[PDB]
Amino acid sequence: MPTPNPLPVKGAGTTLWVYKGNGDPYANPLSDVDWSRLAKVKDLTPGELTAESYDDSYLDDEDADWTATGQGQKSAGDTSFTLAWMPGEQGQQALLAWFNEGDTRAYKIRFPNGTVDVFRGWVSSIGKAVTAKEVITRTVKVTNVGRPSMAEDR
Amino acid sequence: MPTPNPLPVKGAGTTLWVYKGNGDPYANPLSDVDWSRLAKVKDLTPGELTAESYDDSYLDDEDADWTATGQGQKSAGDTSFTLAWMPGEQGQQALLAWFNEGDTRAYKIRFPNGTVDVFRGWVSSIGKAVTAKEVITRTVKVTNVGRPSMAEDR
Amino acid sequence: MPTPNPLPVKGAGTTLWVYKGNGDPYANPLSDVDWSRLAKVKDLTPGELTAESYDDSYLDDEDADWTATGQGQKSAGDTSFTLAWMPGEQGQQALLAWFNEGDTRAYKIRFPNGTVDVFRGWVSSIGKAVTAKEVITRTVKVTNVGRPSMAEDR
Amino acid sequence: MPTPNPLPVKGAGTTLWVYKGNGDPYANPLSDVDWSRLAKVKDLTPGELTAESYDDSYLDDEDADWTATGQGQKSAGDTSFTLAWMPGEQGQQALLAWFNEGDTRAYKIRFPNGTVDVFRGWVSSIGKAVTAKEVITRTVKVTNVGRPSMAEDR
Amino acid sequence: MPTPNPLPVKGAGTTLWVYKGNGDPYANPLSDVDWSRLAKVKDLTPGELTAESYDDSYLDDEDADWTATGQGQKSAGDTSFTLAWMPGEQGQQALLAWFNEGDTRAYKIRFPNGTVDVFRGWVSSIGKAVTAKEVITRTVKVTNVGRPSMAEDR
Amino acid sequence: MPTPNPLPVKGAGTTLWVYKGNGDPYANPLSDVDWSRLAKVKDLTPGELTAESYDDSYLDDEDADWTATGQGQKSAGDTSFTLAWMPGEQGQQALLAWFNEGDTRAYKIRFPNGTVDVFRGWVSSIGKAVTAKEVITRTVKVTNVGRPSMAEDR
């Protein structure tokens, strides 16, 4: 039960948070003193940090048999999470205020370990799913603006 | 049974309505005094509110390692619902009058909660499905013209 | 058994017809006095009435946050039906005469209700399927030329 | 058992033939006096007779609400059949002679009815499938050059 | 058991070989006096001999209703086989020598019949698959340079 | 149990390593004196060594019936491995240091045999998967810069 960082952990217990609007979100992310919680999370796919290949081959080089490339312009991907549709909840009202405002906010993912994943982004997709025998779900996707504060930066 | 907004709800009981043609559809959407009902709904997929990424990178900036973007020109998606084919019903006759007229009308989705979802759009697709052992179904898709009155605007 | 238009119906009993070549197919479609029948129908997918979105955004407008569009140039889709391969039947001989002539003819779909669906189009695809244990099937697809006489125009 | 053209038939018994090289293949196709047989047919998909839509809308016309098109440049599709790999058979040797020569030959499909399907085309694909527990199969595809002699031209 | 060419055969027993580097690979392919063997073959998909359609329609022709084409620039496809990963085997060392040299070599497929399939090509893909409970597999794909010596040329 | 190179082996026991930063990674790859280990590997797909086809057909040649090509500009593919998410592990911290630095490092795959696979590349993708009943997984993909030291170069 005591959270081991060196040991693998199950995903059960992951929580989401959104910054309430103070300064310096990346400083002290392990305190929830100013983070609203998005309860009732069904599933969550974090962003995929990709990178564009940059071509590094000249005409003058001698070894033209194998492709030579280098990393360039890394980009944080999209984070997609599905919640239970609760319109009266303050979190979801703040979420669509975020959508209709267009600003980039800082959202945190708190894992069962003593580690957090802080990203800054703007929401780019909001949808719903209505089924007779299932709870109404709200699917949200956020596009990041770069420079994430990964958990292993501590 | 009393409709809790803060609590998650099942999708069973969702209904559809179309504005009969008075003024100000977004004002007082919780009264059905001027909304015709589209009965016998098989399934319903509401619109997906998406947004186009806007590039915000200049040559003069110093941090060119991570992509920086911002929300731009948000768009409401398509709403697709399937009904049971009832040509004599006034609702479906009004629906194909809507299709053959081309105007943009206001349609409402009433959830089992005390909340409504009002959109304005024009129908862009109408089809049928004929099967020996199943009821004839009419599939309809509506493209929205923007500025939806989401349920959490209250 | 008496055909209720206001009530939903099962698809069993749908029939197909082709105009024998008199005038005004859209007038009095509920009489089969001049319509040949295409018997032995396996399955039938009617046309999908779609529409192209027309852009309505100017530079001068103030609200450039949400996409504004309008319906434009509606088009009837393709109708695809599969019959049992009967080369000696007059209907299928007339069907390939239709294919090899290129003219646009009026075909009717008669539902179990007291309603009909009349379209005008030209056949654009004719194929076969040969299997050891199944009857030989002839698949036909017709592209419409517009202005269908839907059932709810009565 | 006596072959009824007006009645539907099962696909079992379909055979393939290739013209040995006399004149006028379309004349008298119901005699096998000069047609070699391709025995051991696993499956066979005949050609799909498609047609390209030709645009018929002018600026001067009044009805610009519905798309108006017309048939144009009909094309016979590809016929794909799989045989059992028998290199010593005269039929398959003639088939790869056909492939390596490039000429367009006339091949006939004889259905269990008293009807035949004669096409003229050139083979465009020849492959194999090697599996431990299955017979080696040779898959062949032929592209047609147009004007097929369908069975219902009699 | 005696290999019948006119009769269909099962695929079990197919073997692969690579030319050791003498002259005239297409002459006498039924002798393994100078062919190294690639043992432990899991599966093998031979090349697909395709052909590009060449347009033969002029403006002057009278029959412009059906597409007329002709075979042009036939091409042998890719041959893809998977072996068991045996780095110490001389065959696989020769195979990656082939890959890192770039030359086009002649490889033979020996079927359970008394027939062989000789192709000339260069390897264009080499990969691996590591699974806990399965043997490590090496997948290889070879692109041919044309003019195969099919088995029925005898 | 004694590792046979000539004999096929199961994939169980494959390990991953990253160079700690000395010189000449390709020299003596069978010693782990300066290689950090990436423990808890779920699955691993090594790179696929592909090659681009180079056209070798001139107008002057006589044989224009079959495509003639030759190997050109071979490229090592992407290597994708999934680990158990252990942020406190030195290996994963070094891995995201690698990602945020952009340099190309040498990573080794040690098979159950006495053979190693050394590649040089830069990481281009890092993602996560959060599930309630499964361990949190970190998926990593590395793009190679060419000239791999395959196991059969010994």
Numbering used by the authors:
A (entry chain B), B (entry chain E), C (entry chain F), D (entry chain D), E (entry chain C), F (entry chain A): 1 to 154
What do the paper's sentences say?
Here we used *de novo* model building to identify a protein contaminant within a recombinantly-expressed protein sample as the helical tail of the YDC107 bacteriophage. All top 100 hits pointed to the *Escherichia coli* phage tail protein, specifically phage YDC107 – an unclassified *Ravinvirus* from a *Caudioviricetes* class. Structural analysis revealed that the central part of the phage tail has a C6 symmetry, however the overall symmetry of each segment is C3 due to dimerization of a flexible domain.
After two rounds of 2D classification, where only classes with sharp details were selected ([Fig figS2]), a total of 5,927 particles were used for *ab-initio* map generation and refinement ([Fig fig1], [Fig figS2]). The final map had a reported GSFSC resolution of 3.22 Å and was b-factor corrected based on the estimation from a Guinier plot ([Fig figS3]). This final map was used for structure prediction and model building of the phage tail’s core. We chose the top max score sequence with accession code MCN3709170.1 as our reference sequence. Comparison between the DeepTracer model and AlphaFold models revealed that only residues 1-154 were predicted by DeepTracer ([Fig fig3]). This corresponds to visual inspection of the C6-helical refined map in Coot – there were no unmodelled densities. However, the AlphaFold model suggested the presence of an additional β-sheet domain connected to the central core by a flexible linker ([Fig fig3], magenta). Low-pass filtering the C6-helical map to 12 Å resolution revealed the presence of extra protruding domains that could potentially accommodate the unmodelled flexible domain that was observed in the AlphaFold prediction ([Fig fig4]). We used AlphaFold multimer to generate five models of the flexible domain dimer ([Fig fig4]), all of which formed a C2-symmetric arrangement and fit well into the observed unmodelled density. Due to the flexible domain dimerization, individual phage tail monomers can exist in two conformations: forward and reverse ([Fig fig5]).
